[PDB]
Amino acid sequence: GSMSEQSICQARAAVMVYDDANKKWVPAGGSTGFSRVHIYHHTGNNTFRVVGRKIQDHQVVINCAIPKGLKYNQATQTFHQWRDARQVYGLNFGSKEDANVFASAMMHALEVL
Numbered sequence: 001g002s003m004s005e006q007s008i009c010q011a012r013a014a015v016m017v018y019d020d021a022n023k024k025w026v027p028a029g030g031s032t033g034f035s036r037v038h039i040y041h042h043t044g045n046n047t048f049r050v051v052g053r054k055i056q057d058h059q060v061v062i063n064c065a066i067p068k069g070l071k072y073n074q075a076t077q078t079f080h081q082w083r084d085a086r087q088v089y090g091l092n093f094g095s096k097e098d099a100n101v102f103a104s105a106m107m108h109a110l111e112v113l
């Protein structure tokens with residue numbers, strides 16, 4: 001992408017989505033494992049997105065917009081979640097620091113938007 005989109009946070013987390021029909025969390029992209037998850041700020045239009053890529057093979061497993069007003073829920077000290085119309089996303093962070101720094105960056109983003 002272009003240089004006007006910049007990463008403002010990176011954390012290690014396993015990305016899950018909620019299978020609405022089976023009432024179970026499943027790995028984003030089909031295989032359980034940790035990803036490197038960034039919050040990218042596109043400075044041109046002041047928008048944000050989350051993109052995560054598996055660490056072991058760089059599969060892109062999440063690429064989702066963070067709109068104004070998004071509700072970000074810290075369900076546990078290492079599992080955080082949010083929605084869009086298509087999926088509920090969950091991040092199982094690799095450590096409490098990963099979770100807390102990612103959440104702080106998300107909250108700062110929600111205030112910038």
Ligand SMILES: CC(=O)N[C@@H](Cc1ccccc1Cl)C(=O)N1CCC[C@]12C=C[C@@H]1CC[C@@H](C(=O)N3CC[C@@H]4C=C[C@H]5CC[C@@H](C(N)=O)N5C(=O)[C@H]43)N1C2=O
Nearest residue numbers: 001002003004005006007008038040041051052053060063
């Ligand atoms: C891990 C990471 O950011 N690395 C950046 C670091 C960077 C360097 C300089 C300035 C800003 C940044 Cl940050 C990077 O090396 N460089 C190489 C040039 C492309 C990129 C620099 C900026 C942009 C920000 C968006 C990100 C990017 O381009 N990304 C993030 C991963 C995502 C995955 C797949 C492909 C599919 C086509 C398109 C899509 N999904 O529609 N797409 C992406 O959008 C991918 N950039 C990059 O990698």
Ligand SMILES: CC(=O)N[C@@H](Cc1ccccc1Cl)C(=O)N1CCC[C@]12C=C[C@@H]1CC[C@@H](C(=O)N3CC[C@@H]4C=C[C@H]5CC[C@@H](C(N)=O)N5C(=O)[C@H]43)N1C2=O
Nearest residue numbers: 016018025071072073075076079081082083088089090092
């Ligand atoms: C109003 C709303 O939008 N509520 C959402 C959560 C949310 C709140 C606020 C803002 C954004 C979101 Cl998105 C909700 O309750 N939604 C979405 C996913 C399905 C679920 C609804 C019901 C179940 C109750 C149990 C909870 C849940 O799913 N939980 C509770 C926390 C618990 C912790 C970790 C992960 C690990 C994998 C799995 C496990 N095997 O332990 N697991 C969980 O089970 C986690 N539900 C949910 O979150």
